[PDB]
Amino acid sequence: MIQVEENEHIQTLVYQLNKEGKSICGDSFFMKADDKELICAVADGLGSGSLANESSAAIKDLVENYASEDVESIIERCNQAMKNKRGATASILKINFEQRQFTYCSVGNVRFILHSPSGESFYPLPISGYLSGKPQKYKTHTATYEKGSKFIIHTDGLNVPDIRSHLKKGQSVEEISNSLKMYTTSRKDDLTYILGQLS
Numbered sequence: 001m002i003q004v005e006e007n008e009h010i011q012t013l014v015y016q017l018n019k020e021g022k023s024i025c026g027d028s029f030f031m032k033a034d035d036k037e038l039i040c041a042v043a044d045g046l047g048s049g050s051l052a053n054e055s056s057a058a059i060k061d062l063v064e065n066y067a068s069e070d071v072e073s074i075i076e077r078c079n080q081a082m083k084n085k086r087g088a089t090a091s092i093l094k095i096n097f098e099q100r101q102f103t104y105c106s107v108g109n110v111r112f113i114l115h116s117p118s119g120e121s122f123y124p125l126p127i128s129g130y131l132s133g134k135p136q137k138y139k140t141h142t143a144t145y146e147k148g149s150k151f152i153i154h155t156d157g158l159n160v161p162d163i164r165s166h167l168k169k170g171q172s173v174e175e176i177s178n179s180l181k182m183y184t185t186s187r188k189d190d191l192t193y194i195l196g197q198l199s
């Protein structure tokens with residue numbers, strides 16, 4: 001499935017498809033943008049069946065409900081919610097449009113890449129482990145982005161040799177999404193990604 005949204009400050013696209021033959025998706029996402037800010041999150045539950053979904057879905061719900069909190073506060077609520085559950089890998093991103101500032105916090109193998117028109121990228125390494133309900137030492141990144149920056153957040157079901165190149169070349173989130181098409185046809189795992197193009 002594909003969901004697109006747009007306002008004066010951002011255009012986004014969410015894509016999600018299940019593993020081939022698999023009824024219950026283990027990945028979840030949440031995204032909301034208004035005229036002032038964006039919140040979004042992508043998670044991949046551990047385990048399988050309903051139990052993977054229960055973990056990543058809990059993240060989706062908490063991010064929606066606590067969207068006004070800082071990313072580190074939100075991700076700690078998610079961690080707490082994992083206590084008697086499978087757990088999940090997850091990434092949370094907030095953007096304030098007027099300041100062109102983003103904040104980001106993640107644990108596990110959900111990746112985030114932000115490409116700037118100047119040619120610099122923010123492309124953090126994955127933090128080992130996952131959100132299990134045990135204590136974590138979070139790393140929050142805060143940075144300014146330039147107009148024209150394009151980003152993706154994706155689960156491990158998307159495996160792309162040179163993700164930066166697709167962000168650089170694409171001139172719209174629809175084009176980038178189309179640019180990634182060959183990596184979505186196998187469906188070896190659930191595949192979720194959120195793309196954004198920032199004004």
Ligand SMILES: [Co+2]
Binds near residue numbers: 044155156189190
């Ligand atoms: Co996965």
